[PDB]
Design an enzyme around this catalytic site. Structure first.
Site, mmCIF file in Angstrom:
data_model
loop_
_atom_site.group_PDB
_atom_site.id
_atom_site.type_symbol
_atom_site.label_atom_id
_atom_site.label_comp_id
_atom_site.label_asym_id
_atom_site.label_seq_id
_atom_site.Cartn_x
_atom_site.Cartn_y
_atom_site.Cartn_z
ATOM 1 N N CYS A 170 8.994 1.679 3.997
ATOM 2 C CA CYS A 170 9.847 0.551 4.337
ATOM 3 C C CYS A 170 11.223 0.961 4.909
ATOM 4 C CB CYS A 170 10.017 -0.408 3.159
ATOM 5 S SG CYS A 170 10.372 0.361 1.606
ATOM 6 N N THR A 171 11.731 2.119 4.467
ATOM 7 C CA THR A 171 13.027 2.665 4.904
ATOM 8 C C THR A 171 12.942 3.653 6.081
ATOM 9 O OG1 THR A 171 12.676 4.390 3.258
ATOM 10 C CG2 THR A 171 14.039 2.450 2.604
ATOM 11 N N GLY A 215 6.264 -6.186 0.189
ATOM 12 C CA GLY A 215 5.300 -6.335 1.261
ATOM 13 C C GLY A 215 5.954 -6.792 2.536
ATOM 14 N N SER A 216 5.132 -7.249 3.480
ATOM 15 C CA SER A 216 5.624 -7.687 4.762
ATOM 16 C C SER A 216 6.497 -8.914 4.644
ATOM 17 C CB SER A 216 4.458 -8.021 5.718
ATOM 18 O OG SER A 216 3.635 -9.096 5.269
ATOM 19 N N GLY A 256 -3.014 -12.976 -5.153
ATOM 20 C CA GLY A 256 -1.602 -13.037 -4.857
ATOM 21 C C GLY A 256 -1.055 -14.457 -4.708
ATOM 22 N N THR A 257 -1.820 -15.290 -4.023
ATOM 23 C CA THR A 257 -1.426 -16.674 -3.794
ATOM 24 C C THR A 257 -1.434 -17.407 -5.125
ATOM 25 O OG1 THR A 257 -2.183 -16.749 -1.469
ATOM 26 C CG2 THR A 257 -1.946 -18.861 -2.600
ATOM 27 N N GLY A 306 17.313 7.602 2.192
ATOM 28 C CA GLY A 306 18.216 8.061 1.124
ATOM 29 C C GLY A 306 18.559 7.001 0.073
ATOM 30 N N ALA A 307 18.015 7.195 -1.137
ATOM 31 C CA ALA A 307 18.190 6.280 -2.277
ATOM 32 C C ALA A 307 17.772 6.995 -3.555
ATOM 33 C CB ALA A 307 17.342 4.999 -2.092
ATOM 34 N N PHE A 334 0.806 -1.231 0.000
ATOM 35 C CA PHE A 334 0.000 0.000 0.000
ATOM 36 C C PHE A 334 0.826 1.260 0.000
ATOM 37 C CE2 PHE A 334 0.660 -0.106 4.634
ATOM 38 C CZ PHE A 334 0.795 1.231 4.939
ATOM 39 N N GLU A 391 11.130 -8.017 -1.668
ATOM 40 C CA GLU A 391 11.395 -6.679 -1.126
ATOM 41 C C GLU A 391 10.488 -6.556 0.100
ATOM 42 O OE1 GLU A 391 13.382 -4.122 -2.051
ATOM 43 O OE2 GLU A 391 14.052 -4.721 -4.099
HETATM 44 BR BR BR Z 1 16.614 11.081 2.553
#
Ligand code: BR
Ligand code: NAI
Ligand code: BR
Ligand code: BR
Ligand code: BR
Ligand code: BR
Ligand code: BR
Ligand code: BR
Ligand code: BR
Ligand code: BR
Ligand code: NA
Ligand code: NA
Ligand code: NA
Ligand code: NA
EC number: 1.2.1.31
Lengths: 497, 497, 497, 498
Positions: D301-302, D245-246, D229-230, D460-461, D165, D267
């Site tokens: 996520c980051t 996702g998780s 998804g499955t 930062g990416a 999401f 990821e």
């Molecule tokens: Br940043």
């Protein structure tokens, strides 16, 4: 009497052109040198005028470009790539009118004028991605507590001298790459394509100005040999990219060497097509026609030597003579025209000289050989049989549509004959033989920079490095790691311990 | 009278050396030119003699190398790498005696003589893996049913002219890489290191002979400027790698460009160390000592300029002049010696001349500046304070241990002072400041080919490309993609459809 | 009585083998698990015994390996390369006797035993160079005053599980690459090749100990499924490289995935040769012979399916039957023998069951099909015609010399039939047609990891990455950038401003 | 009037082609015979509009059409695939403000970040155009005379792409752009709570493909949840499954793909640390920590979830952070200059409160925040907790909410170990001026994460690098460097031409 003042050529105003145009751009426009008039080769009528660079204009421009470099080299490469992206889009918007200008002032057919602009568009789109990739490896140091990094930095000012025959694309290949690499550019185009240089520069200048960047990032100083020589001798020109004749390029290269500058030389060609006995002749004939007569034989990659296996030599020659007869000749911007004029009256003289020399050296003109009786610089595309492969005239680049045809028997001899000339730009074999193909690509094969199979000598694309060997000068443009020529490598050891 | 005839130098005979040696190898040994005697610079005694190459010898050898090329270029690169592996082991086997010859004839200390041979061993070992890697990309063509490939092929004959000061390693870097890339080599070493050239050639010759390969793959033609000029002018020498002075290198560069050959130029340096106020002085002082006086100041990468922040200048100079006073002088092959002679009497004269010109231009000699009173070509390693950074003598490479010391205050000015000279080989800063380090590595930082941090100017390893910019000539050797200079690129479009 | 105790086997002692050998090495030698006796497959005689790893041995070893890693990962990659160079030379010294052991314990002919050891030597030689190359790019950040670097670091402990059939070379590929990449290794080889694993480990252990490095850098824990499963489940095993059956590999892969480890899977093959109507039959026949029957059909890359154009099917089958009849069978240490035993009696049983299944499915045994009446695990190499391409037994990998032959008409269908199986290792076409070749290499061509032309399915060399797709598991070993599987990537932004 | 799309102030939604009810399957045809979902605006808890999700039959039809489309697409030269991607970039450029605003409306992140995601997709498209002329392998020197050795790369075929999401445009965009130039067809199943964003993006792409006379199933969409998804995870026809996702769901997906010998690109979750050394520039540390911890309301996520501060500067940094937290402008996320929006769901609010209570149970002290905001929508106070042990259970757990756990440290070796001790391995950052420490951090005894940053926070990416993590983050990479290789199959090809 200037074409630009005639209603039918009103479209030239869409490129910002007028009766007399400034030929110097460095953020401001000017030109205090000699005013040149360029002419349409299809009718020898004057188009418009350009005010060229004086010595003071040149000096001012170099200094301004170098000042701009201090800003430009500080912009992250990906952000420089965004500027090049916008250049690509600005070119797209003016593609038809700019290509129409190339057809008018240079004399190549419309589809190729437009195709030229598209080449510049395409290298811009390529360069945008490359601007996030350029660099070198971080390498494992043998020393504990040390890093070892290969860094690449702009060289500074890249001078770009270009030929008449690709008056947009050659500059473009250099510009897009030099720009993303963090360099500023100074362009001196062919005097006979001064309006094209001006038109291109206007497009780029608007982009630079709209992005609040100094215009001298892409500077123009229109001129001739005087300005070119100044560039070659100028220590402030860190890299000089020169596209042009071998004779002039030799002198440019020497001048740059004398001052320990860097040169990128893209010089003459004398390109061979070789058709083996197993060749698809339905492919050979149109390929040879296009390669020899395309752009009226005024591509650096034009086929000038055709080696044909003895078994199929006559059939191919006869088919090619018939194909030559069907060529639609006319104004290069007109519908369905495939064949336009030579670029100058001098080129017509050189064509006639070459034809006469071919005859004295023992060749037979089997098609063409004469000037066409019509306005403009039109000559018949020409086929000469009977010369020895080592005839002096066959070893010379005559920038005109003369194709020298030779018989051969074996692969070893004809590869040697491809390789025996001083030029080393492009080459092509037509064959189905798997081993012969890989031998052609190997160390005993073609010695040229462009080594093609079942496509003629003009076969090239953006993604590969473009250029030649031997008297073609050694430089590369466009794809692969050609970018490294526009940057300086450092090998950097950091003791962090 | 000849050292080789004295029992204590009997070890020279382990390298195949005799009283008079042949200086031409092309499969067979000979030499019809002038006989040269080389001398030990530690005692000015003659070692042995070498029969150099006449013009006829050179012609014979080029022709045999070119014939051998046809065989060698047909050998798969990995199998060429196997030959290089065997060369590496052959050098390994003779490392101590070969290192001793380097110390005896050239005059550098034993650990450096041995280290030079180890460098050649190391690049051989690196080149074995590289022989399975060299090549270009297969690229995605824009044309359906076409392949686009970047091929690399040998250039042919690689001429290699080398300097006195690295009489084994520079040849080695060129040889190992040229060989795996499918080239044959022709070596013309410094005349004053002729025995070393012969000794190395003997080692390689045996490997080629044992593998039933033509010896002319690694040809040798000992001589001076005559042979070297012939090489520069010879269209048969596809690539000329030249390591030497800028003055000579300029002329070689011009001669090669005149004939559209390729050159790889590795020329002079005038290398700066810059010590910022936050530098670790316990690292700066011994780093500067080694960089400045190592090899008696006769490395192309020797530190000749030391910029010290005004806050720490006097402390560093005082500590450095104490360090110089502790240097152990002796015969360079003898135990614990750190300092040997200069290579020639002429070098002593040049040393003395610079020391005096430094004074005329306003400098003060704070340590050394005198010849040593002893056999051989020994001078005192020298430190000059007080000159302006733009003093003409400081801008000149004098190939001797003279270190010019300058004060500075700010970063931008001292980076400019690094960069103001015509040379561009190596450079180093000593600092802890992260931003300063990355600025030094960036577009407004050092303009040199080697850009170091907290390690002196002599810091380099085989995994990176080695060379300089500006008057250092632009060539690279050893690592990264330096191999590409020894090969020709082709861009190949194959219509398979 | 044990073969190692008989005088004609005294050469086994050159490998340091005794009647009972420690099968655990971690700096110290031991093994408290079950004692295995290994048998020569040519005669079912016992060779010698190996003390396998208990659970406690395994635990101690993993702990010691992780402690060793602390040291090893701090050694510069090029210095790790130096260790690998020494391992390669140590293997060279023992090539004949180690090769002899491979023939004795595993059962392949002597040239292949020696060749296998040479493969390890060659990957060591390659890895020395690669140790100076491994790393990633320095990238141009979009952020002013920031650097962007891709770093690669070791994963830590690389567990290596290997199959019986390449008992030296598979370990070697993994070892050489893992080592230079800064990892420590834990080997569990095939229990039926225990003596080979011990012998190789003794050679490496001596190198590590001579260099005063902890021996657990190259640890050995001999055992079976129990130790292999422990490795698959062990979070301390950062990468598990597994070479073996698809059936076992699937479970290893799932176990590793459950714990978020990394796996490198090299699993089964069902490899096809396809002969088109234009194939050189003098090439097809011996290539099919070698690919099908080499190593008694026990390579992962063995040809198991042969598709022949209808026009040439019967002639090719007739020529192959004749060729099979001339195979020289016997002791794999007899220098004129080309065909030895299968590795185990179970393999004989599986062979026989596949042959009888082929008949039940409608196939005809045109050559062979029987177990040989002689000592050891000998079977006749077998050719089966008349099955449908999608016959169940043809879609199954039976690890024995059974070649299923099929007719075809067109290129599209036969490419589909190459691809329709679950395995994806190797594949070969024989043809002279240029377009077909490039299509085979293209997106509608072979789906396998090895895609060969005019060389059979066992065609591979160290410079390329080796492995397959689909049920072959996806992993790669040896060349190109396979090394990245043994390291972790980080993307690093450094704000230095 | 119940649906935001039927209220006049949100008429801009129609500029994206959205209506009251929208088809959530695209395969050249639009459809959706599965369950209708209504998505909600987290800022005001009002329903936006509806999407008809994929039934099994829709899924089956779409995979079949995608695989037929692949036969055409894979035959198109990569540079010409690049040209299609170029045009996708331009089509996205045209809708950037309105698609950004929908990201802010349906997902809840602030406008500059919603716009930013669309810009990221535009930017990867521009990158991919160049890459499309570059992708390939080396031609290598064979040891065999008269043989060539070539490393070829070809499409894997159908790339399924499952997304989370929280980056409902950019993650698909990175996978799409790269997969496309590599000659793959794509099948997207986005987060159900971001269905309108998935639909809107697919409308943009569909138009470009159809305008270029290409089959739309090249970029197929099957909206749905775990059931779709499955199916993707189990489908042998899905050659690569890229899952964002998780960790909990990703582990299961990775196991399903492995079972069938497919390829996965995982990821997964993060538990990202910032470490501030005594020599750190505090004027940089404080705003960096603030952005990294509170940006996107702690739902990147980051996102920085652990802050290690040297004992000497701990109290000062915490005090300055508390002060900065109090100054954040809260509001509706689609309004320019609002810096702080709602959590994505009411469930996320409850999980936030649960995590705050767990922190207190484990000995932590809430020094700022900890409560729900007194306002409509799913707003919570961004929260700072001190006093926990670095090995506290709740600190080792990813809670997708703005809770920052602060720890003291003394020494470099211990704090590097503490960065590394968790199961996640996505991003990491140190703040320091020390040259040696910086290179050690980047080295084999430094951070174990996929993103290893210095003097810039954990988020930062940029697209030029490969993006992803290690350990329980799953190992996959997206975007730059040679990430493209994961979307292709390598072959090593020996040609005997002699
Ligand atoms: Br940043
Ligand atoms: N792709 C490739 O590079 C290669 C693949 N192979 C394949 O290997 C097979 C033949 O070798 P084998 O030794 O018979 O295979 P195998 O699968 O029975 O055993 C392989 C290895 O796995 C170990 N092992 C057995 N059960 C295990 C378990 N439950 N967990 C972990 N490890 C376990 C064995 O002890 C042995 O070391 C064939 O399928 C062949 O194609 C062989 C060589 C190369
Ligand atoms: Br063409
Ligand atoms: Br000879
Ligand atoms: Br050093
Ligand atoms: Br059995
Ligand atoms: Br083979
Ligand atoms: Br259904
Ligand atoms: Br349904
Ligand atoms: Br909860
Ligand atoms: Na005319
Ligand atoms: Na003296
Ligand atoms: Na038997
Ligand atoms: Na609320």
């Amino acid at each position: 009497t200037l074409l630009i003042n005639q209603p039918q050529y009103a479209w030239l105003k869409e490129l910002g052109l007028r009766e007399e145009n400034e030929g110097v751009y460095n953020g401001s426009w000017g030109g205090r040198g000699e005013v040149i008039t360029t002419y349409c080769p299809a009718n020898n009528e004057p188009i418009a005028r350009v005010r060229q660079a004086s010595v003071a204009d040149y000096e001012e421009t170099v200094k301004k470009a170098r000042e701009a470099w201090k800003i430009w080299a500080d912009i992250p490469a990906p952000k420089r790539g965004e500027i090049v992206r916008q250049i690509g889009d600005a070119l797209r918007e003016k593609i038809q009118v700019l290509g129409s200008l190339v057809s008018l002032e240079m004399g190549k057919i419309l589809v190729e004028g437009v195709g030229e602009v598209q080449e510049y568009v395409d290298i811009c789109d390529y360069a945008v991605g490359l601007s996030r990739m350029i660099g070198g490896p971080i390498l494992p140091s043998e020393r504990s507590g040390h890093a070892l990094i290969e860094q690449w930095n702009p060289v500074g000012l890249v001078g770009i001298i270009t030929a008449f025959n690709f008056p947009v694309a050659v500059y473009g290949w250099n510009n897009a790459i030099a720009m993303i690499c963090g360099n500023v550019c100074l362009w001196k185009g062919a005097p006979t394509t001064s309006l094209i240089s001006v038109a291109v520069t206007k497009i780029i200048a608007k982009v630079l100005e709209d992005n609040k960047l100094p215009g001298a990032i892409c500077s123009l100083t229109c001129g001739g040999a005087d300005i070119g020589t100044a560039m070659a001798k100028d220590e402030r020109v860190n890299l000089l990219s020169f596209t042009g004749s071998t004779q002039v390029g030799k002198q440019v290269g020497l001048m740059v060497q004398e001052r320990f500058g860097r040169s990128l030389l893209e010089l003459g060609g004398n390109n061979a097509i070789i058709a083996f006995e197993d060749a698809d002749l339905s492919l050979v004939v149109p390929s040879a026609l296009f390669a020899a007569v395309g752009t009226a034989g005024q591509r650096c990659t034009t086929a000038r030597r055709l080696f044909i296996h003895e078994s199929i030599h006559d059939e191919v020659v006869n088919r090619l003579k018939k194909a030559y007869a069907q060529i639609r000749v006319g104004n290069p911007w007109d519908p369905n025209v495939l064949y336009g004029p030579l670029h100058t009256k001098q080129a017509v003289s050189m064509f006639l000289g070459a034809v006469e020399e071919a005859k004295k050296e023992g060749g037979t003109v089997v098609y063409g050989g004469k000037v066409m009786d019509r306005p403009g610089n039109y000559v018949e595309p020409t086929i000469v049989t009977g010369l020895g492969h080592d005839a002096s005239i066959a070893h010379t680049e005559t920038f005109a549509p003369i194709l020298y045809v030779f018989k051969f028997q074996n692969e070893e001899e004809v590869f040697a004959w491809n390789n025996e000339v001083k030029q080393g730009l492009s080459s092509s074999i037509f064959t189905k033989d798997l081993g012969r193909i890989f031998r052609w690509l190997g160390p005993k094969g073609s010695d040229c920079g462009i080594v093609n199979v079942n496509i003629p000598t003009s076969g090239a694309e953006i993604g590969g490095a473009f250029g030649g060997e031997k008297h073609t000068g050694g430089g590369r443009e466009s794809g692969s790691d050609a970018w490294k020529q526009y940057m300086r490598r450092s090998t950097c050891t950091i003791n962090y311990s």
